[PDB]
Amino acid sequence: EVLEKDITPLQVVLPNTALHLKALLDFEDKNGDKVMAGDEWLFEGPGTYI
Amino acid sequence: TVPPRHYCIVANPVSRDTQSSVLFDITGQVRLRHADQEIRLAQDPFPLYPG
């Protein structure tokens, strides 16, 4: 076991705030389909994630 | 005399290159080992060599 710490799974929803995600080494890891590269997404609404 | 050593490419980031050491070869590619120089990604957590 290596490269680990304690992340508090931060949450936000609606006008409140926003999440400027990117993909550090990732291509397609999420539900609907498959992202193209190390590009960037927005996040607005109820719950958080991984 | 060798205490610490490794063969780890910490995720896709911070990756590494090498002077080639091609010992095993598939039915697709048989390569020059001490004539070429190589580049490595995360998809290769195979161990180390001599040259």
Curated annotation (Swiss-Prot), chain A:
Signal peptide segment: none
Residue ranges of MVP repeats: 10-50
Coiled coil: none
Posttranslational mods: Phosphorylated on Tyr residues after EGF stimulation. Dephosphorylated by PTPN11.
Subcellular location: Cytoplasm; Nucleus
Described purpose of this protein according to its UniProt entry: Required for normal vault structure. Vaults are multi-subunit structures that may act as scaffolds for proteins involved in signal transduction. Vaults may also play a role in nucleo-cytoplasmic transport. Down-regulates IFNG-mediated STAT1 signaling and subsequent activation of JAK. Down-regulates SRC activity and signaling through MAP kinases.
Subunit structure, as described in the record: The vault ribonucleoprotein particle is a huge (400 A x 670 A) cage structure of 12.9 MDa. It consists of a dimer of half-vaults, with each half-vault comprising 39 identical major vault protein (MVP) chains, PARP4 and one or more vault RNAs (vRNAs). Interacts with TEP1. Interacts with PTEN and activated MAPK1. The phosphorylated protein interacts with the SH2 domains of PTPN11 and SRC. Interacts with APEX1. May interact with ZNF540.
Domain remarks in the Swiss-Prot or TrEMBL record: MVP 3 mediates interaction with PTEN. MVP 4 mediates interaction with PARP4.
Annotated protein name in UniProt: Major vault protein
